[PDB]
Structure formats: structure tokens, C-alpha cells
Amino acid sequence: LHRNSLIVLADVALFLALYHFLPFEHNVVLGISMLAFIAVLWLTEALHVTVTAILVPVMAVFFGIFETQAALNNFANSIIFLFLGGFALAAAMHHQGLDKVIADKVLAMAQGKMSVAVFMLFGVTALLSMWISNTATAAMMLPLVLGVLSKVDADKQRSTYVFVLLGVAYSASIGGIATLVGSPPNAIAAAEVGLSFTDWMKFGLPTAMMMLPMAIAILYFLLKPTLNGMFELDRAPVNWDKGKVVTLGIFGLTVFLWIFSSPINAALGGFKSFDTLVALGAILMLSFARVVHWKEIQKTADWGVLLLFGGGLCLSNVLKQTGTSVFLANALSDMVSHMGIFVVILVVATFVVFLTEFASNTASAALLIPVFATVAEAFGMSPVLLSVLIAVAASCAFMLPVATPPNAIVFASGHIKQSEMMRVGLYLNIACIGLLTAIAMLFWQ
Amino acid sequence: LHRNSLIVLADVALFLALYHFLPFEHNVVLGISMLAFIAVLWLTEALHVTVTAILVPVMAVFFGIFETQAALNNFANSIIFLFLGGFALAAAMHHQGLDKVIADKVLAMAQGKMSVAVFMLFGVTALLSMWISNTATAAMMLPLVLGVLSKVDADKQRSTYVFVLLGVAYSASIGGIATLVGSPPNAIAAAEVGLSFTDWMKFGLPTAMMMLPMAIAILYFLLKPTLNGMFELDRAPVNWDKGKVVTLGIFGLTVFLWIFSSPINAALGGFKSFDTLVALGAILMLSFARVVHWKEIQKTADWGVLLLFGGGLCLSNVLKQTGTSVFLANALSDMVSHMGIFVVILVVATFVVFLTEFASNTASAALLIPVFATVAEAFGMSPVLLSVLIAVAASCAFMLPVATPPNAIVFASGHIKQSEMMRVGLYLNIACIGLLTAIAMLFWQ
Ligand code: NA
Ligand code: NA
Ligand code: NA
Ligand code: NA
């Protein structure tokens, strides 16, 4: 009777149709029919992102692509644990309140000026985003933004207080593109192509360094009258208590090891997924140093996302095993030989950046990273470039809400108009496709 | 500075000592030193049960026993997912309220008599326990017990209202021994020896059928004056709403397939971990039929327990790979040849039943099932008997609280004395060691 039940029923019909009607070697039919089925369920989200992910192995297994255990093992991938370390590391510094002190210390650095208030709000949202989440950093930033935007309270004076809202909304998404922990797409890319933490930062951080100014400049050069106003630093001041220095200590050490992982691991005998070990080490150091309880990490952890990771890897393998990867590569062979490498990555970049407006960031990467990376491998090229590209591009949701929760969070603020965001985003999207295709061209040789 | 930090530091010393001082082939030293380390951390619970479990792979990997991914794969074992199915199945019928209606319908079956009130409370606690949890079924039962025990309110008349409290506390633990989902020890045994859902019920259910009457009979034949009193059926009546029949429908179908798994799977082509697939199927049926959301399952799911599962399997493998299983089997060789098979299982059964008073049910099984099952295999015997034995025995916590949360739940009721429970439990423990050794002898040939 419901909308989504129909989407699902329609999808079941679509599969049954594709299955009985496509004219290929049986494996390819099955692979294509599945790829289509899942593609729908993740882009529509008729079933939860995670329920769909659990559906992948169960299909794989029932259609004899893999054996139950083999399909399930997909879920214990090392990256999934590296991401659990991220959740624990965040769990700690939220419950400890280290996210509050980093907000005040940097926010009070601005003596009482609105010019250097919001400009220090975007820098904090993005910095906090690098390690925490996008949705978490958005909902955590909202009261701190509405707090500041209460002196220039006149909401007939909207564009002073819309530049500041939509600013952090993007700063949370752009801050996600900094490191391997931060947003699921990045992790999906890492798991698909086997990136180290320090590998995804070599790509991502320079892009966030570039993108955040470019995003503010575009929001700025629309309707900003913010060079005026005063502050209201209203609430109890913060102070480093029982080892917020310790949480910072562990965090710092953890980040240090993640960066210097290459020479540390190499000069240790070369352990296998050193970054995942570091991440698990953090979960231990944080528990031995008593700084955060487990129930805290179990609440903070988005296990739904952790299951999505495995389900998407399961899919990636379903594509190889059924040969659907090679079949598509054969089909696209003429199209891609006629297209220049510029043309291809411009088309890829454009596609995602606009697709990601219609569906979840991760849900988009969950679908696209496998399809592309595997087809890339069928062409005998390194699946890294396309994957990292899609990873970044999926986190470029700037037009409407529903694109990302961070958009729908500053939107429920019953103030910003649908039309307004839709056109700053339309600009920033094109602006991004430039920067990405640009940087993607640069990181070639 | 804290107690547990010292326990941990002492343990680190113990390891360092055992490591540098034991006189064996290096692998055995490492294995023994590890086995001792983890043994402590799970029995003391100086670190959380789950943090310790995460510690197992990280050790294994660092001490070159396994490669990072190999050790981590331990966590994607099919049983872990079967148990996630259990969490989802419970999540549904709690949020749906099917646990409330099963309580009232069966509780109001008793017209208004205290004699058939508490006797229908134990039967419901145990029945509800089979599928939900122990701790969850205890905390859910407490208000419903205090509700009834308010007509015979005189707490100078204690033993009317202590028999009813300590009754459900045990009924929740004994109801856990019915099926594979229900209490983690049971799952640990299943994962160690590869039991099917229907396999653990063949053992377990007859034991719960036997044990629950035997437990009431012992609580009864102490200080019961409950053949007197009246009811107070006070609260809004229940009624089957938007497919509580559907949740019951899915649940029923799921349980049906779990029982008939052998012939259904065999007459389906023999899929690998059919019970796990059934469990995942339940997660899907429950979501497609819209009866429960995902965030609900993510709250209900004890991911901490799910991680514990894998960490304990990682341990089991650590023992084999380092040959510590074979080394202990060699050491116990003379002791066990001098001991009759009765003697052995009487010693095993006694050991756990009393050990489980001092530490968590699961924490006990997490340590003991691997050590025994593997040593059993070194002797070239089926690891099943010993494992299933330990699994049941670990859920026999009847003496003090701290033994199980269900004990500490009816204890905070600021009414039951330390001494009182300690002696009913001392009787029931011996009573159990009889029944177990008895049944364990019977299920031999
Ligand atoms: Na982020
Ligand atoms: Na998106
Ligand atoms: Na139970
Ligand atoms: Na116990």
C-alpha cells in the first residue's frame, strides 16, 4: 500500500523481467539483473541503505555466486574496522567534551566580530568534520550557529543569516573529503582499491584545502551583508578537565601514527593493514586510559554504515565473479576509445556531482565505486583514480536538501528558501566539476 | 590509580613474566602467555568484555600468529549474523509490543489467583527469554512482577514476594538455555563446533524443560507462603493492532524454518549456513513488511556481544596455530586417562557452574569453550559435547548477583538479602551439576 513497497515490488518485477529477457550467457544476466535491482534499492532507498546491503550476500548466496561464509567474510574487511576506530575516536572526544572546547577556544579567538565569527565557524565545522562525521558535525554545529546569529537577529535581514547557515552545511561536507575517516564514500573507495589512511589524505586534503575557500567565495559573492554586527559570547566558558588532554593525547598519537604509517610500519617489519591496527589500537588506548566507556562507542558507532561497507564489497565481487565487470567493459569499449581521458573523467565527475543531489552521499558511492573500479580493472587500468574521484564527487551535495542530511539540517531551520540553496548549489556543482576534473588531470603523472 | 588499571598492569606484568620465563618451544610460550592474559581480562572484566575481544586479533597480528585480515575475518563468522537476526527479531516484537500482549493474554488467563499468577510469571519469563535475551527479559519482567506483588504488599511478609522475584531471575537464565539465540554462551558453542539452530535445541530445550520445574521446586520448598492472596489486573488491556499478527507471522515462519532447516535445506540443494540465511531472511521480511525500522534494530543489537563472538573465535584459532591446544592435551593426557569420562564431565560441569558465579555468563563461555573444544580435538574427540556442556553450565548462575545481570536486577529491588539467594543458589548449583552430568551421560550413545 505504501510508496516504497511499490518501488520494491516494481524492482522485483524489473529483476524478474531482466532475468527472463536479457539475451546473454547466464552469469552476465544474473549479474546485470542484480546490479540493476540493488542500484534501484540504494538510489530510491525504498529499503534502508543497510537492509539493501544485507540483501546483497543473501542474493549472492542463494543464486550460487558465492558460499554463505565467503559472501559474509566481505563484512570483516579491515577498512570496516579502521572506520570503527573512527567512531570510537569520535565517541571519546564528544563524551569528553573536547569538541566543545575546540569550538569555544577558536570561537572566542574572535573578540566579538561577526566578520571573523562566521569565518571561524566554517573553519571549525570543517576541522571538526575531518574526524567526526558529516551529519554529526552539522547537528552539533546548528545551535552554535543560531547562538551567534542572534545579535543580527533581524530575519528580515535574512542574507546575513543564510550565508552563515548554508556555509556550515557545506563546510561539513567539504571537511569530510579531508581524510579516510570522515564520510563513508571515502572509506568505500579505500576498501575497493586498498588505500592507506595517508593515501586518501594525499588526494583528499588538498581538495578540501581548495574547495572550502571556493565554496565560501561563491556563497559570499551572492547576497552577503555580514561585514556588520557584534557578538554575544553567551554560555559557561570551557576548561581542560580530567585529561581532555589525554583524549587529545591519544587522538594526536593516533593521527600521528596514521600519517607516518608508511615508515613506521616499514620499520616495524611491515604488518598488513597497519592503519586498521592503529585504529584498533586507539579503541584500546582510549579504554585502558579509561577516557571513554564502551556503551558510548556503541551509541556513536553507525553499525548500519559498517554493514553497508561489507554489502558493497560483496557486490563488487558479485560483479567480477559473474563477469558483469568484463561484459560492461566490452560494451563500453568503443564509447571509451572514442572518448578522451579528459572527456571520460569530465563525464564521470559531472554524473556523480549531479546524481548525489538526488540521493544519499554514501548510497551513491555504494553503487558507483564498485561498478566503476571493477570495469576500470577490466580495462586493465588502476581502479584508484576513478574510485577516489567518485568518492569525492559523491560528497559534493550542494543543491537541494535530501541530498545530504547536513543540507536538510540547516533547512529545517525554517528560514532558508528552496530556490535559494538550489542556485548556489547549481553554481558550486559546476565550480566543483571544474576543480575535480582539474585535480584529477593533475594527479595523473 | 584505579582498581582495574592495576589489574591490567598486573596482567601485563604476568604476561611479560610468563613470556620470558616459561621453558617451551616459542609458539607454546606465546600461546600460553596470551591465553593467561585474556583469561584474566575476561574473568576480572578490568577492560570491557568487548575491548578484550578486540585485543585478541591485535595481539595475534602483532605477534605474527596471523595476518591482519585473516584474524579479522574471525568476526564475520556466519553465527554472528545468525545472532544479529535474533536481535532484529526481538527488536521487532518489542517495538511492536508483541511482548506486552503475550504477557497480558497469559497473565489474565489467571483469573485473579496468586497461586496461578507467579506460576504463569515464570512460564512467561522463560518463554519470552528463549528469543529475546536474559538481561532484557529480566528488566522487562521486573515492573510486571512488582505490579502483581502489590496486593500481598506486606514486605514483613517477604518470602511470598522473594520467591516470586528470585523465580523470574532464574527463569530468565534457564529460558536462555532453550535455543541458539537467547544467550551468548550458546552461540559461542555453536560457532566453535558448527551447530545448527535445530542442533542446539535438541540438546538445550529438554534441559530447560527439566531445569525450570527443578528450580521452582527448590525455591518453593524453602520459604513459600504464596497459596494465599488476590490479583490486581491494573493497566490498560492489550489488543492485536497493525500486524502484531504480522510480526508473529514472520517470527513464526522464521522459527518454523529454523526447526525444519535440515529437510528444507537438504531439499533445496543444501545451502551452506542455512540457519544464518534464515536469520538474515527474517531481517529482510521484517523490513519489507515495514514492521520494524532499522534504527530500532541498531539500538536492540548488542554489537558488543557480536564482536565478542569473533574475538573468542580468534582466540580459539590462536590456540591451534601456536599448538597450545596440543601442548595442554599432552599435559592433561595422564590426568584424563586416570579420570573416567564420568569423572571428567563431573569435574568440567562442577568447575563452570561455580566459576560462573564469579564472572559474566558469556565472559566465562568466551574463555572456556575455546580452551576445551580445542584440547578435546587434540585428543581426537568431538568438541561438541564439552562445548555444549560449558554453554549450558555458564548460564547456571544462581548464587550471588554480579554472576548475571538478571540476578543483580531483582536484587536492586532493595528487598532480597545477600545470604538468602546465596543458599538457594548453592542448592540449585549442585542440583544442576547432577542434572547436567546426568543428561551429558545420557546424550553419549
Ligand atoms: Na566529515
Ligand atoms: Na548526496
Ligand atoms: Na534468554
Ligand atoms: Na555468570
Coordinates of N, CA and C and ligand atoms in Angstrom, one line a residue, chain A residues 356-357 359-361 394 397 403-404, ligand 2:
Chain A
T356 N 24.4 12.8 -6.9 CA 24.5 12.9 -5.5 C 23.5 13.9 -4.9
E357 N 22.9 14.7 -5.8 CA 21.8 15.7 -5.3 C 20.5 15.0 -5.0
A359 N 20.3 11.6 -4.3 CA 20.4 10.5 -3.3 C 21.5 10.7 -2.3
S360 N 21.4 10.0 -1.2 CA 22.5 9.9 -0.1 C 23.9 9.9 -0.7
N361 N 24.9 10.6 -0.1 CA 26.3 10.5 -0.4 C 26.8 9.1 -0.5
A394 N 30.8 12.3 -4.7 CA 29.6 11.9 -4.0 C 29.3 12.8 -2.8
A397 N 27.3 17.4 -2.5 CA 25.9 17.7 -2.5 C 25.6 19.1 -2.0
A403 N 19.6 15.7 -0.4 CA 21.0 15.3 -1.0 C 21.9 14.8 0.1
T404 N 21.9 15.5 1.3 CA 22.7 15.1 2.4 C 21.9 15.5 3.6
Ligands
NA2 NA 24.3 13.0 -1.6

